[PDB]
Design a protein around this ligand. Structure first.
Ligand SMILES: *[C@@H]1O[C@H](CO)[C@@H](O)[C@H](O)[C@H]1NC(C)=O
Ligand SMILES: *[C@@H]1O[C@H](CO)[C@@H](O)[C@H](O)[C@H]1NC(C)=O
Lengths: 52, 439
């Protein structure tokens, strides 16, 4: 798993790899059904459902 | 004019710092540091190395009983044994049997390997701060090496940069560092002259040339048997030759924030923590007045493609009307979005594109171009891939980021029943105005 901060992984003697997450893919819309909330599970989850 | 600013402490990420000045053509710069180096102090506590147990050939006194001589040796260990009986070429080395005694003595030294191979327990405290940076300065790629104190500044091409002092007092080390030849370890060593048995630092030296040696190994002799003409001893366990196997992991692979560890001298590389203040002094020989600057007007901005990723997130196109042919710069007036291309060529009545990135989907912003403010708006889309191997810190936005018309949605939600409880207060007080006269 990758944190919002980022990962770094070394394999063998070879050169390290860096990794970072995007705003991942998807989940609802700017839609006619209200539904921005699953964009939340896109956009930095597990907090802020405390806010709703 | 001069200018004091703050950039976030990270590598490979440029930053557009504006220089606006009254009555003059503005000038933008871009910061991009390649290595910020934390260099700790150096104070050697003690070297350590692999020891060497030396015994000489053992003394034999038959028809006699030998005895030791006390001597300040590194782990002097002596013993006389009775009842022994050696064997060699011609049987017993001696003639009689029950009186043959053997004197034995053992001591320890350093090795020959301590000249070129050693570990060192080391005392290191709060660091300096060195840095190397690159600026594009009117199309001029300029490197700079500078220390982040406050007076090791730099003059390049009529440009005064001073960096530091670092706000981040955090360090990737402790007060106790052991180092060996390609790595360091944030370890807790035993002090000098109190080395444990069976531990690196059982033998100790202050320099690589200190003949005075501390030892704690217990080379305890044992009893040799009949014919076994030799010296039997309790083996001292090494420090190194299992401490090489009980390394754990170096600080190269457990440092926080991706801090690299170099050597000779040992230093932390790219410790991305916090932020750096940077001051720039550039005098007025380099500026231009606005009468010589091509000023533009009549801008129409639109964003035909925006994708809120960490990459070049979107391309907007803005129509301008230039007064004459020339060069001038662009910059955001909000810290959310950022703009890659610093300055741009303009000629007349034309348009130009610009690449930008952000995090917030409802991209509502303003761009300062060429001493002129322009307003823009769009709604973006999430990117369609999950991972990447490069960040860009426009995304670092709080909880007062800008949502969509979801703002208008939640504005619609907070309808409120204060009006109905207000008419409740009014109906109870019109009960109470039967007699609510002089309270
Ligand atoms: C070899 O060891 C010596 C001993 O300190 C050291 O000075 C030198 O830099 C080392 N050379 C290499 C190539 O490791
Ligand atoms: C300056 O250097 C950077 C990286 O080396 C490069 O991407 C850029 O094109 C250069 N710009 C100029 C004007 O030399």
């Amino acid at each position: 798993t990758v944190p919002t901060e980022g990962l770094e992984v070394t394999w063998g003697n070879n050169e390290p790899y860096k990794y970072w997450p995007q705003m991942s893919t998807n989940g609802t819309a700017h839609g006619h059904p209200h539904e921005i909330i699953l964009y939340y599970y896109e956009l930095y989850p597990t907090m802020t459902v405390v806010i709703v | 004019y001069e200018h004091v600013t703050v950039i976030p402490n990270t590598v490979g990420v440029p930053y557009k710092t504006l220089v606006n000045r009254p009555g003059y053509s503005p000038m933008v710069l871009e910061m991009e540091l390649q290595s910020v180096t934390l260099e700790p102090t150096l104070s050697l506590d003690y070297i350590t190395c692999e020891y060497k147990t030396v015994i000489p050939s053992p003394y034999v006194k038959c028809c006699g009983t030998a005895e030791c001589k006390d001597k300040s040796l590194p782990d002097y260990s002596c013993k006389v044994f009775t009842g022994v009986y050696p064997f060699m070429w011609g049987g017993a080395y001696c003639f009689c049997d029950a009186e043959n005694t053997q004197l034995s003595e053992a001591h320890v030294e350093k090795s020959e390997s301590c000249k070129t191979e050693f570990a060192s327990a080391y005392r290191a405290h709060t660091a300096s701060a060195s840095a190397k940076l690159r600026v594009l300065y009117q199309g001029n790629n300029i490197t700079v090496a500078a220390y982040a104190n406050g007076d090791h500044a730099v003059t390049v091409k009529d440009a005064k940069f001073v960096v530091g002092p670092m706000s981040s007092a955090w360090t990737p080390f402790d007060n106790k560092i052991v180092v060996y030849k390609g790595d360091v370890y944030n370890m807790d060593y035993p002090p000098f002259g109190a080395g444990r048995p069976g531990q690196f630092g059982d033998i100790q030296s202050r320099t690589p040339e200190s003949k005075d040696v501390y030892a704690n190994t217990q080379l305890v002799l044992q009893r040799p048997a009949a014919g076994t003409v030799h010296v039997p001893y309790s083996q001292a366990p090494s420090g190194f030759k299992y401490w090489l196997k009980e390394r754990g992991a170096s600080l190269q692979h457990t440092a926080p924030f991706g801090c690299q560890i170099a050597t000779n001298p040992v230093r932390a590389v790219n410790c991305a923590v916090g932020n750096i203040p940077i001051s720039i002094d550039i005098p007025d020989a380099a500026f231009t007045r606005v009468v010589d600057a091509p000023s533009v007007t009549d801008m129409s901005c639109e964003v035909p493609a925006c994708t809120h990723s960490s990459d070049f997130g979107g391309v907007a196109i803005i129509k301008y009307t230039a007064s004459k042919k020339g060069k001038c710069a662009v910059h955001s007036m909000t810290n959310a979005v950022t703009i890659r291309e610093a300055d741009v060529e303009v000629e007349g009545n034309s348009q130009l594109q610009i690449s930008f990135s952000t995090a917030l989907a409802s991209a509502e912003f303003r761009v300062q171009v060429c001493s002129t403010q322009v307003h823009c708006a769009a709604a973006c889309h999430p990117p369609k891939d999950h991972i990447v191997n490069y960040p860009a810190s426009h995304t670092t936005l709080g909880v007062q980021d800008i949502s969509t018309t979801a703002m208008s949605w939640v504005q619609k939600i907070t309808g409120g029943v204060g009006l109905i409880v207000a008419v409740a207060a009014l109906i109870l007080i019109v009960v109470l105005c039967v007699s609510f006269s002089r309270h």
